Ligand binder design. Structure first.
Ligand SMILES: [Zn+2]
Lengths: 119, 92, 270, 154, 60, 97, 58, 58
DNA sequence: TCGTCTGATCTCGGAA
DNA sequence: TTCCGAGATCAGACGAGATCGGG
RNA sequence: CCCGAU
């Protein structure tokens, strides 16, 4: 968003303006996202309650807000999806992000996310 | 601990039941290779190299392998307990 | 000029003063001491007036399982109690574990060791076998051992004085070491309840003229000498809200032109 | 470089059903061979057994008496299934010289069945939707003729 | 531009309900001497102005 | 949690925290407060929901935490509630993710 | 929180003869004089600082 | 605003100057893109507060 | 949108 | 045993600049 | 109600 383009008065920071090189995303199907998630390594509903806990190697994959299993190695998952997206097998817009404070990786195929390109 | 099980399997000859999540590949003797540095790779059928390494914490519960023989006409018999799970992933 | 540690100083301070609310955010009572020349003596006064929960001063507490009972135990860090200048002892804790609303009101709580460990076994009723002991392990390291319970914490400042972030004024004014003749608040209600109305007039003069010179914004005192003297002339401090106008004015349309036009017109027809 | 080979062992794995226990991790508890009174279903196993309680712990006594039904005392189980797609997991028995793959059937978790408090409340009373499916099983729940026994088999 | 904003109202239409001058320049205006400007006229002590400015030339 | 099918209390802590250090202070909070009234039963603990919801609540627990899907296999629903509790014991509204 | 092997319903201590009889099916482990230990070490209030006049001039 | 980092150009947990709001260039030599953003962020707190203060002091 | 003040029921506690 | 009175704990309220301009 | 002025 533009930092300096805003009204003043009632809407001093409540009516923003999009910047130049942005792109709002549209929705898509979640088929190949799940299909690559379950190959790359995830498992849920068979794991003992204890697993998903303070143990470091339990990053739990979340897609669009629904848990899709847990991965022992977060890096392989974030990196492999990212190489796959760059290769073009997964839609360019989908984003894999990782929060290490709470071990949840976050595959978002939401549609409506503010996006932008980088080199 | 990824290749340790194989070395521990090497340390005691006792047969160990293992849990394997193969990738979702339909059928279109397999070979397992342990790379130097512990990077176990299963060079499976079709000569594809699938990397399988580590898994969820296991043994934190009792997981038991049982062969249901339809005991009304057979027997349900526990054959083994469980060991660390193993997950197989395709590689790129 | 309204248009033009932490203490609130802006318009949310002046709006907080004019309302004269009973409870304000960040109330601060400053206090001068008798012997303002050494940090250790004012240390001793500081621990005397700021609250310290049983939890803050102790080592590894737990229940301990002995045949036919389960008594809790507290190891009570004694290096600390001498480090933080404060005067607790296991007798003083035992009086403070008592009369502390946790129903331990009898002499069930004991005093073991070398005045270094207290023990309370078990209550009488309300699932007394275990469920009060798992209840007891939570409320026991949150009873105030000593000090004014209301006061959040007291911070020294250098001659020496100490400012508190609390509200219980006369319990602070009466402690040993603080010359209670020279101690002020910034909560104009707790000066009105404790120090009379005339000291509550002088804080409304001061704490407006303190927050007005803090923001630049010079102002005559004769304006604040009028606003304070209106605000406290009918008995008690009447803050200028919707509610304080009812206790200040008799005429209806002056109240009815202000807020609550519906109720003020019907009630004055009743 | 252990190059151990994996046999795609065709030894019938249709019999193989993994059983899980999110109940017994405290002291390497093994379920123990002696207990019988075995009852098992093919779909939604609901393993019902003779997990008779010890008497080394001191009698338990009146509260056991207070239990109402205990039949020594069955500590049965209802199988929480997790069989959505059930071929993603198919490992078997592995030496350091040989490796035998076998594709299992649906894994089933086995938490403890109560039904003592369930039946207990009913007793006081005396004083969902298509829950069982269209065919009411009429069979899977009937199947418990069970024999857990010890045999070295592959 | 000041041609769109120049405005004066001598005596014109009054609103049908409250018989005060209307709001807007499109409706020949009358600008609200608001209650904040009432206090300014209070603080000057001008008493006979406020009777003139809020009874005589608004709602007589 | 007992209404959701996981009836035992060992499972619930195993969900919330196996490493205990602060998730032990989940213990005397609620699973004791659950146990303080003798109410260990799955069907009976739908019943307390069956009163306040203004056997009949197997369905009306689908209008609670919706998008975690259930086919009357509530195991996926439990972890998502357990992770919601997991955050609190470990504890930005304007941030553009 | 010590759990029950057999139902898993959490620790209850009956003060009769030192057992752990749970609200469910009795599994009372009558722990002998083994001494229970739960010392959850708290925090210790740590001294003070004089809030000095080293800097206020700027 | 991000995790342990003011803008994703700096490193995580950087407490460095010119990574948490210091601008080195004056207005003659012109601000740089991170520097221009932090000056905008500190500039809007002027504009935001006059909207809300007059909503209260009125 | 809380934020405020109000005023309306409960409960552990002392006096006769 | 009694209980009469009082500190504790929810629920509901009715507030939140000023003007001017046009569709 | 939006927008816009200050
Ligand atoms: Zn039990």
């Amino acid at each position: 968003l533009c930092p300096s383009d805003t009204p003043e008065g009632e809407a001093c920071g409540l009516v923003k303006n999009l910047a130049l090189m942005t792109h709002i995303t549209t929705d898509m199907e979640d088929g190949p996202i799940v299909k690559l998630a379950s190959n790359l390594g995830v498992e849920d509903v068979n794991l003992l309650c204890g697993e998903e806990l303070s143990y470091p190697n339990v990053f739990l994959v979340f897609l669009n807000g629904n848990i899709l299993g847990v991965i022992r190695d977060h890096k392989k998952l974030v990196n492999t999806f990212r190489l796959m997206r760059r290769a073009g097998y997964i839609n360019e817009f989908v984003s894999i992000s990782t929060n290490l404070t709470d071990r949840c990786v976050y595959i978002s195929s939401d549609g409506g996310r503010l996006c932008r390109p980088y080199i | 601990s990824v290749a340790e099980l194989l070395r521990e399997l090497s340390l005691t000859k006792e047969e160990e039941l293992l849990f394997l999540q193969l990738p979702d590949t339909l059928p279109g003797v397999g070979k397992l290779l342990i790379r130097k540095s512990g990077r176990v790779q299963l060079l499976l059928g079709k000569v594809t190299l699938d990397v399988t390494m580590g898994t969820a914490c296991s043994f934190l519960q009792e997981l038991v392998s049982v062969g249901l023989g339809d005991s009304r006409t057979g027997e349900m018999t526990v054959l083994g307990h469980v060991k660390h799970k193993l997950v197989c992933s395709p590689d790129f | 000029p309204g248009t033009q540690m932490n203490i609130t100083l802006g318009v949310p301070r002046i709006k907080e003063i004019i309302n004269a609310s009973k409870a304000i955010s960040t109330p601060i009572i400053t206090a001068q001491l008798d012997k303002d020349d050494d940090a250790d003596y004012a240390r001793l006064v500081k621990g005397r007036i700021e609250k310290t929960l049983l939890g803050e001063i102790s080592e590894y507490i737990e229940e301990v399982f002995l045949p036919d009972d389960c008594f809790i135990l507290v190891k009570l860090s004694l290096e600390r109690i001498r480090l933080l200048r404060l005067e607790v002892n296991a007798e003083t804790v035992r009086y403070s574990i008592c009369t502390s609303k946790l129903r331990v009101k009898p002499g069930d709580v004991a005093v073991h060791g070398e005045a270094v460990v207290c023990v309370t076994p078990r209550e009488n009723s309300k699932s007394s076998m275990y469920y009060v002991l798992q209840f007891l392990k939570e409320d026991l390291p949150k009873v105030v051992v000593q000090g004014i319970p209301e006061v959040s914490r007291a911070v020294i400042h250098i001659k020496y004085k100490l400012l508190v972030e609390g509200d219980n004024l006369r319990a602070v004014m009466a402690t040993h070491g603080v010359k209670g003749t020279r101690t002020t608040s910034n909560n104009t209600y707790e000066v009105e309840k404790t120090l009379g109305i005339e000291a509550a007039r002088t804080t409304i003069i001061n704490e407006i003229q303190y927050t007005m010179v803090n923001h630049g914004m010079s102002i005559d005192r004769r304006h604040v000498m009028l606003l304070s003297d209106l605000m406290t002339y009918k008995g008690e401090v009447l803050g200028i809200t919707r509610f304080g106008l009812a206790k200040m004015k008799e005429s209806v349309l002056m109240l009815a032109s202000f807020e609550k036009t519906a109720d003020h017109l019907f009630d004055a027809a009743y | 470089v252990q190059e151990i080979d994996v046999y795609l062992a065709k030894s019938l794995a249709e019999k193989l059903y993994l059983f899980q226990y999110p109940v017994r991790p405290a002291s390497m508890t093994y379920d123990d061979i002696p207990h019988l009174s075995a009852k098992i279903k093919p779909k939604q196993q609901k393993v019902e057994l003779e997990m008779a309680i010890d008497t080394l712990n001191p009698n338990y006594c009146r509260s056991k008496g207070e239990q109402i039904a205990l039949n020594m005392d069955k500590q049965t189980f209802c199988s929480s299934q997790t069989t959505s797609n059930t071929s993603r997991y198919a490992a078997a028995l592995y030496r350091q010289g040989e490796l035998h793959l076998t594709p299992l059937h649906g894994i089933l978790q086995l938490r403890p069945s109560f039904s003592y408090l369930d039946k207990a409340d009913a007793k006081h009373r005396e004083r969902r939707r298509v829950q069982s499916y269209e065919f009411l099983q009429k069979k899977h729940a009937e199947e418990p003729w069970v024999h857990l026994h010890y045999y070295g088999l592959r | 531009m000041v041609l769109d904003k120049m405005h004066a109202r001598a005596r014109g239409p009054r609103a049908v309900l409250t018989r005060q001058p209307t709001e807007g320049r499109s409706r020949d205006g009358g600008l609200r001497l608001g209650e904040m400007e009432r206090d300014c006229l209070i603080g000057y002590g001008a008493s006979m102005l406020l009777l003139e400015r809020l009874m005589i030339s608004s709602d007589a | 949690f007992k209404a959701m099918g996981v009836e035992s209390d060992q499972e619930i802590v195993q969900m919330i925290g196996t490493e205990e250090h602060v998730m032990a202070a989940f213990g005397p909070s609620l699973e004791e407060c659950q146990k303080a009234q003798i109410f260990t039963q799955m069907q009976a603990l739908k019943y307390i929901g069956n009163k306040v919801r203004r056997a009949r609540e197997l369905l009306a627990s689908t209008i609670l935490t919706h998008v975690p899907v259930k086919e009357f296999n509530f195991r996926a629903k439990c972890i998502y509630t357990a992770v919601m509790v997991r955050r609190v014991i470990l504890a930005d509204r304007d941030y553009y993710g | 929180l010590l759990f029950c092997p057999g139902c898993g319903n959490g620790l209850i201590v009956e003060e009769g003869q030192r057992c752990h009889r749970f609200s469910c099916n009795t599994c009372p482990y009558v722990h002998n004089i083994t001494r229970k230990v739960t010392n959850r070490k708290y925090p210790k209030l740590k001294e003070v600082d004089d809030v000095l006049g080293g800097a206020a001039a700027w | 605003g991000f995790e342990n980092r003011s803008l994703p150009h700096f490193e995580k947990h950087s407490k460095l100057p010119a990574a948490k709001g210091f601008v080195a260039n004056s207005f003659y030599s012109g601000l740089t893109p991170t520097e221009f953003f932090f000056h905008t962020m500190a500039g809007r707190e002027g504009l935001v507060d006059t909207a809300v203060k007059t909503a209260e002091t009125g």
